[PDB]
Symmetry: D2
Subunit: 333 residues, 4 copies
Amino acid sequence: EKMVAIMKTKPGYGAELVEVDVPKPGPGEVLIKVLATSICGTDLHIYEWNEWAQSRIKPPQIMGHEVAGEVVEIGPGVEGIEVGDYVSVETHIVCGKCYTKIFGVDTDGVFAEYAVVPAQNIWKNPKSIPPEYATLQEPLGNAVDTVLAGPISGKSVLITGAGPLGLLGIAVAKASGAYPVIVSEPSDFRRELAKKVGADYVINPFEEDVVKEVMDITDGNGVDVFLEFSGAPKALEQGLQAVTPAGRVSLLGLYPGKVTIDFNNLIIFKALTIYGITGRHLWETWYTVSRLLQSGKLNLDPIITHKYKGFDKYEEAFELMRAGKTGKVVFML
Amino acid sequence: EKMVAIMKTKPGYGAELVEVDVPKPGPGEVLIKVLATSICGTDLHIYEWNEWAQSRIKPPQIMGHEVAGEVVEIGPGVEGIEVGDYVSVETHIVCGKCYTKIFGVDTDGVFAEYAVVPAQNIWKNPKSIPPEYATLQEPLGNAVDTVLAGPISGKSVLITGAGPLGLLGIAVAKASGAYPVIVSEPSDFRRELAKKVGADYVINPFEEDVVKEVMDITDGNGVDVFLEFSGAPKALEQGLQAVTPAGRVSLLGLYPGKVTIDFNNLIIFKALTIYGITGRHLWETWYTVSRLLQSGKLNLDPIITHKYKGFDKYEEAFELMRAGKTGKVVFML
Amino acid sequence: EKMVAIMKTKPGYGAELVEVDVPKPGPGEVLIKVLATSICGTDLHIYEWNEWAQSRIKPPQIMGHEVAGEVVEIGPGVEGIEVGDYVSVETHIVCGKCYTKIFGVDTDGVFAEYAVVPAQNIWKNPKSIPPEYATLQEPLGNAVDTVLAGPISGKSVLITGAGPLGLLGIAVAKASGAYPVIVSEPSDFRRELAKKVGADYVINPFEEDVVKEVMDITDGNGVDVFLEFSGAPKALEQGLQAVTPAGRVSLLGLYPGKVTIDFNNLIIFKALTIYGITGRHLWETWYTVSRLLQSGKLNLDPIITHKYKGFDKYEEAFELMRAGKTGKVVFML
Amino acid sequence: EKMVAIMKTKPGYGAELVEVDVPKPGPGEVLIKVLATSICGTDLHIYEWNEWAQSRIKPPQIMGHEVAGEVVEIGPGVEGIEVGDYVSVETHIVCGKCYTKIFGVDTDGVFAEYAVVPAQNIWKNPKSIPPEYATLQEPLGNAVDTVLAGPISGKSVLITGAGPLGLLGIAVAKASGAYPVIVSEPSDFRRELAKKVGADYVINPFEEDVVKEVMDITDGNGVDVFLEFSGAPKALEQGLQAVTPAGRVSLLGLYPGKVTIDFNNLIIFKALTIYGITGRHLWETWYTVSRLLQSGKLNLDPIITHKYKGFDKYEEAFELMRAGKTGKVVFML
Ligand SMILES: NC(=O)c1ccc[n+]([C@@H]2O[C@H](COP(=O)([O-])OP(=O)(O)OC[C@H]3O[C@@H](n4cnc5c(N)ncnc54)[C@H](O)[C@@H]3O)[C@@H](O)[C@H]2O)c1
Ligand SMILES: NC(=O)c1ccc[n+]([C@@H]2O[C@H](COP(=O)([O-])OP(=O)(O)OC[C@H]3O[C@@H](n4cnc5c(N)ncnc54)[C@H](O)[C@@H]3O)[C@@H](O)[C@H]2O)c1
Ligand SMILES: NC(=O)c1ccc[n+]([C@@H]2O[C@H](COP(=O)([O-])OP(=O)(O)OC[C@H]3O[C@@H](n4cnc5c(N)ncnc54)[C@H](O)[C@@H]3O)[C@@H](O)[C@H]2O)c1
Ligand SMILES: NC(=O)c1ccc[n+]([C@@H]2O[C@H](COP(=O)([O-])OP(=O)(O)OC[C@H]3O[C@@H](n4cnc5c(N)ncnc54)[C@H](O)[C@@H]3O)[C@@H](O)[C@H]2O)c1
Ligand SMILES: [Zn+2]
Ligand SMILES: [Zn+2]
Ligand SMILES: [Zn+2]
Ligand SMILES: [Zn+2]
Ligand SMILES: [Zn+2]
Ligand SMILES: [Zn+2]
Ligand SMILES: [Zn+2]
Ligand SMILES: [Zn+2]
Ligand SMILES: [Zn+2]
Ligand SMILES: [Zn+2]
Ligand SMILES: [Zn+2]
Ligand SMILES: [Zn+2]
Ligand SMILES: [Zn+2]
Ligand SMILES: [Zn+2]
Ligand SMILES: [Zn+2]
Ligand SMILES: [Zn+2]
Ligand SMILES: [Zn+2]
Ligand SMILES: [Zn+2]
Ligand SMILES: [Zn+2]
Ligand SMILES: [Zn+2]
């Protein structure tokens, strides 16, 4: 039995759409049939084959890691998982000995009709959640950990960056009672998506003064919460200036390099609480994500800008991403 | 200049609708013109004149404490407040020396066309918030402190009691991303109001087994959060049984007397976190309430079951309350 | 090769000192040579063979669970543990699937010269910690989770109950900067031990009014923290009355049955934070315990009232415990 | 009646020891007789008259702000304070309207035999606390807010900087159960003081590799808590590298200017919690400080390196400070 897969055949740009054997689940593994799979920034780096990918990816290897699938076969030893289960996957494979590898980065991914998954990284989904939303749970998890690092209901918020993560952040913040949610994004396309998801105010940082606008919106008090989703040094500076004294900051975005910041006046004298964010990858975050999805309060439709039937148009998909003309791209099978 | 007022003229049942002089604001006080004022359980006790009222109320005295008004005159010394300001009032008058008196309980209230208010208890409202909603801010504050005593977004919740406070609790929980929100209320009328506000599931405790139903809804895990809004001993027992181990409980409801509870198995062995709730009455809670109101996410319309024009039908209003046929009653001026 | 062991041979009172084969470690297990082992309340119940033991203990079975030992042999599969390692044991054997069995309760214990231990429940000890202190880590863990459930440095504290757990609680609280630490204990012997460990004030509840004394010590403010280590209904009532409004309570002690408490005035109106405590049994607590032991700040010497060489005098040990004439009893090998 | 005072007579270096009228307390003020007063970094800047002082100090003005005194006269309106009360002073005079001025910076200080103090900034001291320790409460408050920003008992700690604040930090951390407490300080004199206060390990950053040493002490895990008390850019970098992933950081030290930091790897990928610290100046911190002082657990003797009788040798005192040959200097009256 053969299957179609988007694979990084060798070092270099792009990828190849090929047909390989349907993998067989070994001890502690299960086989899932892919229903939907979405593309992430990490996948784009592997595609473009940058410095990062050039040092960690070992081709040939199937790409992708975000998925919504159905278990079709369970390997030896597996317990608690049955054929027919609707599932998604946690990408971080931890060892549990730390004081490890990433699914779809150090192993074959889910951009194929079927995929092998370690049983321990399986998350069961309620049948009511559509595949196109279920596949966004890993990214949603990062957004949830960023937004909910502290209290947010009835709090004013400044979100810098409206890429897919920032958009998911807006959706989580609004569903969590945040108001007003202010979003700064230079891209016209993404700034408009932010508005559609639910941003109460949007700011174009290349045409307006972010801090001034925030001060106007918050009557000079600043925002209670600043969430950094862009990775732009300037945005970090602006948010630290815009956050109210004793406010909370969550940093998810990754910068080009080191950043030069006025710690004395913006962090120390303002007595801020700053949380560095990276994926929890523990079930607690997944429980929160699942419930928010089941609640119907997450306005995700505007975020899914592209839905492809099959993997055939993969090249077009990756190109649209590089051109910054996408929110979230999903492959439907 | 005279004004109409609902006043507790003397000890006994009921109250009198009279006309008295429009009060004049003294040092540290301001005069507000009432736009809307709502009735609370405390007001009903003063009306019925029970043991509690019989020991603290000193008639004659104007009733009521929940209000939305406009400042028409500022007394001597007052700073930061100007004529024309749209405001609401914090009822607890604290001393700031503790490690005191209640507005509308130990002083004249707001069930009149005008009312004198200590400047320090004034809260300025954004002009966008309608009077009928602004007057519910004190009760909303109790609901916010109960619901938001801990994390709630993407958490399952059991609310026992759907009286006005429980209804406001449901509205706050839903706006805060809680799901599913399960409400137990024996009253058919109020149980239906709960559904209209936004309860995901409702339970009639006199016809169903609360714990069983919760277990069914949560697949045997129990709820992450239990909020007690009824004051019924049985409900407290049920919630403690229904809450997941290591879950959180917020207790607002007041019981008839002491309660007998299995601490060993329900609290200690389940490692619960229990918060006793009573009104914050500090600005932080008011900031949260104001933002949630401005967000438009609080489904308050179903809670306001009665809107009276003027105070003339006050007797009918209080009677409907005793008959348990109301959510929140508001007087519009 | 044979070894001496204190074993519950059959249903009934007492136990037998016998000689059995030195167990052999199977897959995922290791064999430790016991250096020191201490007696706990649970062991006494198994000895006395009460209702609880009569329903869970399946004789014949080696008693005891608190230990400090040295690994002498590692079973198949075991990684991270080498022969010669100085270790202690976590008693709760969890499954990791919950939203299980207890070492020394549902399995052979450590009251023997050698004992088999699941590798996953092994905790490595720094060689600087003496065996007689290392064996008290499980009980210390319960005390740490109770005392440190919230902030405690520079906080006033009321501890009810000075049994071994309460004594360990006093030691942890003092090492953590608590002051003053007030201890209520009716037993003259244990009340004196409390003073020796480091209690700043002691109260004899059968001769004095606990709440009055606390109020005198705290100038009418009450204590910031109330830790219940007795399991006595009256003590729970007194602590809830003695704790300052908005204070914190940690409940570890287990009551005879249900308790009748004034929730309205003592918990709700005082806006308390109540934590039900039961053993963490996760590494975080063990890390805290280990560091506190290494710090030399825990005054444990007064708590170890009896040190026996070998198991021969086991009957005398258990009897002294029932007579309430002990703090902590340790068997040295 | 005249009194001696250390006063900044005019712009420029140094100060003058003069005799002026004993001030009289006006409305809301009280007069205290100084028993002990200590010198702070702020006082040294006013003495040296740097850019900061050159822009905020308005001479003539009495210097100093840290004090332990006795109330000798109460002004009009004052309540709750009686002649004979042993007190200390909170330096931050807040307005309570914020979403202001500093005692001893924008007003006459306490380096005189008597001083006028706003009643609201008075803190009553237990008579058991010696004047030389009571006068260190404001600085201790900064140290407490830094150390206790999060949990610390049984946690490993790295403190960078052993100036007076860092020394007080070490004393608070040890009294709070921290272990091991690692201190990095280039000054031989201060590094030795750190050891005397109670540091478990000391590091000379100009002769050793701080991170390497921390890794050796913590077996490659890093410290649970990093407290920055130096204000040195390099120290901030080292602590962020030395703190364990998901650890906590408290920043009190103020840097020369902006700092360039690797946010991606040290804060974001390590999921740190960072607290910017500046003085609480609210009673809660004062309550904690007072109890820790009453506990006798703070090893403050080594920190007080100089005790002067009277103000006569003020010039010598300030010079010793600039030469970095002091811990804390106290004037005894
Ligand atoms: N810490 C973690 O664990 C983690 C995990 C995943 C992704 N990330 C990071 O989160 C960030 C967002 O990732 P993404 O997938 O949405 O990528 P993205 O490429 O879509 O970038 C986010 C957005 O920032 C916008 N932006 C650029 N300069 C800006 C400025 N000055 N102000 C406001 N917005 C500005 C861009 O136009 C873009 O739309 C990245 O830095 C990514 O590397 C972090
Ligand atoms: N702690 C505080 O600071 C504070 C402040 C205000 C009000 N309260 C209390 O909050 C509670 C609710 O007040 P409210 O104004 O909404 O009053 P309410 O009279 O409307 O009572 C709440 C609801 O509980 C329902 N109920 C009765 N038995 C029940 C059961 N077994 N299970 C579920 N529901 C049951 C009643 O039918 C009613 O609709 C009261 O106990 C009130 O005294 C507490
Ligand atoms: N929740 C958990 O996970 C857990 C785990 C272990 C032990 N425990 C419980 O912790 C408690 C203490 O256990 P222990 O081993 O120290 O037992 P213990 O028998 O030594 O009892 C504690 C002390 O309470 C004292 N006491 C009795 N009445 C009192 C009163 N009115 N006021 C003050 N003190 C009073 C007794 O004299 C005794 O010294 C028990 O209830 C035990 O069952 C709970
Ligand atoms: N944020 C606030 O509210 C606040 C309030 C008061 C003081 N402070 C600041 O706290 C800090 C400490 O003040 P202080 O009075 O103890 O002053 P201090 O002059 O005594 O300086 C602290 C110590 O840092 C040491 N140091 C210098 N470079 C170092 C390095 N690379 N590694 C380790 N130690 C190094 C110095 O030798 C000195 O002993 C300062 O930056 C001060 O301005 C902050
Ligand atoms: Zn992804
Ligand atoms: Zn704009
Ligand atoms: Zn434009
Ligand atoms: Zn990741
Ligand atoms: Zn994940
Ligand atoms: Zn009310
Ligand atoms: Zn039903
Ligand atoms: Zn029915
Ligand atoms: Zn109230
Ligand atoms: Zn209030
Ligand atoms: Zn034990
Ligand atoms: Zn006594
Ligand atoms: Zn006696
Ligand atoms: Zn246990
Ligand atoms: Zn344990
Ligand atoms: Zn100072
Ligand atoms: Zn060294
Ligand atoms: Zn040297
Ligand atoms: Zn200051
Ligand atoms: Zn202060």
